[PDB]
mmCIF file of C-alpha atoms and ligand atoms in Angstrom:
data_model
loop_
_atom_site.group_PDB
_atom_site.id
_atom_site.type_symbol
_atom_site.label_atom_id
_atom_site.label_comp_id
_atom_site.label_asym_id
_atom_site.label_seq_id
_atom_site.Cartn_x
_atom_site.Cartn_y
_atom_site.Cartn_z
ATOM 1 C CA UNK A 1 -14.341 -6.193 11.898
ATOM 2 C CA UNK A 2 -15.614 -4.704 15.206
ATOM 3 C CA UNK A 3 -17.159 -1.306 14.435
ATOM 4 C CA UNK A 4 -14.699 -0.017 17.023
ATOM 5 C CA UNK A 5 -11.760 -1.206 14.922
ATOM 6 C CA UNK A 6 -13.315 -0.126 11.617
ATOM 7 C CA UNK A 7 -13.561 3.375 13.047
ATOM 8 C CA UNK A 8 -10.006 3.115 14.405
ATOM 9 C CA UNK A 9 -8.630 1.894 11.041
ATOM 10 C CA UNK A 10 -10.619 4.421 9.000
ATOM 11 C CA UNK A 11 -9.604 7.199 11.381
ATOM 12 C CA UNK A 12 -5.936 6.420 10.845
ATOM 13 C CA UNK A 13 -6.438 6.023 7.098
ATOM 14 C CA UNK A 14 -8.091 9.495 7.139
ATOM 15 C CA UNK A 15 -5.361 11.062 9.293
ATOM 16 C CA UNK A 16 -3.668 13.360 6.748
ATOM 17 C CA UNK A 17 -1.359 14.948 9.356
ATOM 18 C CA UNK A 18 1.998 14.009 7.890
ATOM 19 C CA UNK A 19 3.592 13.871 11.389
ATOM 20 C CA UNK A 20 1.890 10.609 12.373
ATOM 21 C CA UNK A 21 3.199 8.629 9.407
ATOM 22 C CA UNK A 22 6.553 7.237 10.495
ATOM 23 C CA UNK A 23 8.593 5.610 7.815
ATOM 24 C CA UNK A 24 9.487 1.993 8.523
ATOM 25 C CA UNK A 25 13.045 2.361 9.842
ATOM 26 C CA UNK A 26 12.017 5.395 11.850
ATOM 27 C CA UNK A 27 9.157 3.246 13.156
ATOM 28 C CA UNK A 28 11.435 0.278 13.811
ATOM 29 C CA UNK A 29 14.121 2.138 15.767
ATOM 30 C CA UNK A 30 11.367 3.715 17.862
ATOM 31 C CA UNK A 31 9.982 0.346 19.011
ATOM 32 C CA UNK A 32 13.501 -0.890 19.731
ATOM 33 C CA UNK A 33 14.047 2.065 22.063
ATOM 34 C CA UNK A 34 11.100 0.644 24.005
ATOM 35 C CA UNK A 35 11.700 -2.566 26.049
ATOM 36 C CA UNK A 36 15.031 -2.789 24.163
ATOM 37 C CA UNK B 1 8.446 0.572 -6.115
ATOM 38 C CA UNK B 2 5.602 1.490 -3.724
ATOM 39 C CA UNK B 3 6.568 3.588 -0.688
ATOM 40 C CA UNK B 4 5.930 2.226 2.788
ATOM 41 C CA UNK B 5 4.444 4.310 5.614
ATOM 42 C CA UNK B 6 3.232 3.383 9.119
ATOM 43 C CA UNK B 7 0.652 5.174 11.229
ATOM 44 C CA UNK B 8 1.905 5.752 14.764
ATOM 45 C CA UNK B 9 -1.171 4.255 16.473
ATOM 46 C CA UNK B 10 0.236 0.927 15.339
ATOM 47 C CA UNK B 11 2.872 1.349 18.053
ATOM 48 C CA UNK B 12 -0.145 1.633 20.332
ATOM 49 C CA UNK B 13 -1.758 -1.479 18.815
ATOM 50 C CA UNK B 14 1.502 -3.412 19.224
ATOM 51 C CA UNK B 15 2.183 -2.930 22.945
ATOM 52 C CA UNK B 16 -1.528 -3.429 23.580
ATOM 53 C CA UNK B 17 -0.699 -6.958 22.373
ATOM 54 C CA UNK B 18 2.774 -7.342 23.941
ATOM 55 C CA UNK B 19 1.052 -6.743 27.290
ATOM 56 C CA UNK B 20 -0.490 -10.219 27.030
ATOM 57 C CA UNK B 21 3.036 -11.633 26.799
ATOM 58 C CA UNK B 22 5.531 -9.629 28.842
ATOM 59 C CA UNK B 23 6.334 -11.085 32.287
ATOM 60 C CA UNK B 24 4.826 -14.479 31.372
ATOM 61 C CA UNK B 25 6.105 -15.079 27.810
ATOM 62 C CA UNK B 26 8.718 -12.398 27.048
ATOM 63 C CA UNK B 27 10.078 -14.463 24.163
ATOM 64 C CA UNK B 28 6.840 -13.990 22.212
ATOM 65 C CA UNK B 29 7.336 -10.205 22.214
ATOM 66 C CA UNK B 30 10.308 -10.405 19.833
ATOM 67 C CA UNK B 31 8.668 -13.255 17.904
ATOM 68 C CA UNK B 32 5.426 -11.411 17.174
ATOM 69 C CA UNK B 33 7.259 -8.175 16.480
ATOM 70 C CA UNK B 34 9.676 -9.849 14.080
ATOM 71 C CA UNK B 35 6.694 -11.433 12.335
ATOM 72 C CA UNK B 36 5.164 -7.977 12.062
ATOM 73 C CA UNK B 37 8.291 -6.438 10.569
ATOM 74 C CA UNK B 38 8.417 -9.341 8.129
ATOM 75 C CA UNK B 39 4.817 -8.934 6.977
ATOM 76 C CA UNK B 40 5.193 -5.185 6.658
ATOM 77 C CA UNK B 41 8.569 -5.172 4.858
ATOM 78 C CA UNK B 42 8.478 -8.412 2.840
ATOM 79 C CA UNK B 43 5.141 -10.233 2.790
ATOM 80 C CA UNK B 44 2.867 -7.301 1.953
ATOM 81 C CA UNK B 45 5.241 -5.486 -0.458
ATOM 82 C CA UNK B 46 5.628 -8.747 -2.335
ATOM 83 C CA UNK B 47 1.992 -8.832 -3.416
ATOM 84 C CA UNK B 48 -0.214 -6.394 -1.497
ATOM 85 C CA UNK B 49 -3.557 -7.111 -3.233
ATOM 86 C CA UNK B 50 -3.308 -10.856 -2.713
ATOM 87 C CA UNK B 51 -4.110 -10.820 0.995
ATOM 88 C CA UNK B 52 -7.692 -11.052 2.139
ATOM 89 C CA UNK B 53 -9.830 -7.904 2.387
ATOM 90 C CA UNK B 54 -10.678 -6.638 5.855
ATOM 91 C CA UNK B 55 -13.493 -4.215 4.937
ATOM 92 C CA UNK B 56 -13.920 -1.911 1.960
ATOM 93 C CA UNK B 57 -10.534 -1.277 0.347
ATOM 94 C CA UNK B 58 -8.591 -2.303 3.477
ATOM 95 C CA UNK B 59 -6.674 -5.573 3.591
ATOM 96 C CA UNK B 60 -5.011 -7.594 6.323
ATOM 97 C CA UNK B 61 -2.646 -10.516 6.910
ATOM 98 C CA UNK B 62 -2.575 -12.568 10.118
ATOM 99 C CA UNK B 63 0.813 -12.742 11.799
ATOM 100 C CA UNK B 64 0.214 -16.502 12.441
ATOM 101 C CA UNK B 65 0.447 -18.339 14.845
ATOM 102 C CA UNK B 66 -0.546 -15.204 16.764
ATOM 103 C CA UNK B 67 -4.156 -14.157 16.234
ATOM 104 C CA UNK B 68 -3.170 -10.557 15.502
ATOM 105 C CA UNK B 69 -3.432 -9.188 11.974
ATOM 106 C CA UNK B 70 -1.900 -6.250 10.137
ATOM 107 C CA UNK B 71 -4.629 -4.116 8.586
ATOM 108 C CA UNK B 72 -3.420 -2.088 5.633
ATOM 109 C CA UNK B 73 -4.271 -0.003 2.557
ATOM 110 C CA UNK B 74 -2.581 -0.203 -0.875
ATOM 111 C CA UNK B 75 -2.742 2.548 -3.425
ATOM 112 C CA UNK B 76 -0.751 2.354 -6.622
ATOM 113 C CA UNK B 77 1.965 4.545 -5.040
ATOM 114 C CA UNK B 78 1.935 3.623 -1.374
ATOM 115 C CA UNK B 79 1.299 1.001 1.278
ATOM 116 C CA UNK B 80 0.002 2.389 4.590
ATOM 117 C CA UNK B 81 0.223 0.107 7.636
ATOM 118 C CA UNK B 82 -2.900 1.176 9.559
ATOM 119 C CA UNK B 83 -3.370 -1.116 12.546
ATOM 120 C CA UNK B 84 -2.446 -4.298 14.395
ATOM 121 C CA UNK B 85 -5.636 -5.691 15.951
ATOM 122 C CA UNK B 86 -6.659 -9.103 17.367
ATOM 123 C CA UNK B 87 -8.896 -11.676 15.617
HETATM 124 CL CL1 CL C 101 3.966 -10.328 -7.701
HETATM 125 CL CL1 CL C 102 -0.685 -15.631 -0.851
#
């Protein structure tokens, strides 16, 4: 909604670098490591 | 089955929200995160075009009661969790 966030969401959509796209369980375990 | 992928900056977006809860309301942190994992793994995969558009082809789904939403994109092959922003 805020042009800031539209840029942020389009940026990430446009990020084609495969290294930034964590699968879900990868992603989950990572957050658990934090504050867990 | 569509394949499910999460940008890393979501991790950023998350703790940017947890901040408003740690120390004072640490119970919310697990609540809101478990809502998020729900929406991402069950709610959105169930019917990804049903949830309201955010802008252009992007969609979102509020993790109610929290006023944070999950912005996302749905091609015929994939579902890409793009952000978790406030609203
Ligand atoms: Cl359906
Ligand atoms: Cl619905």
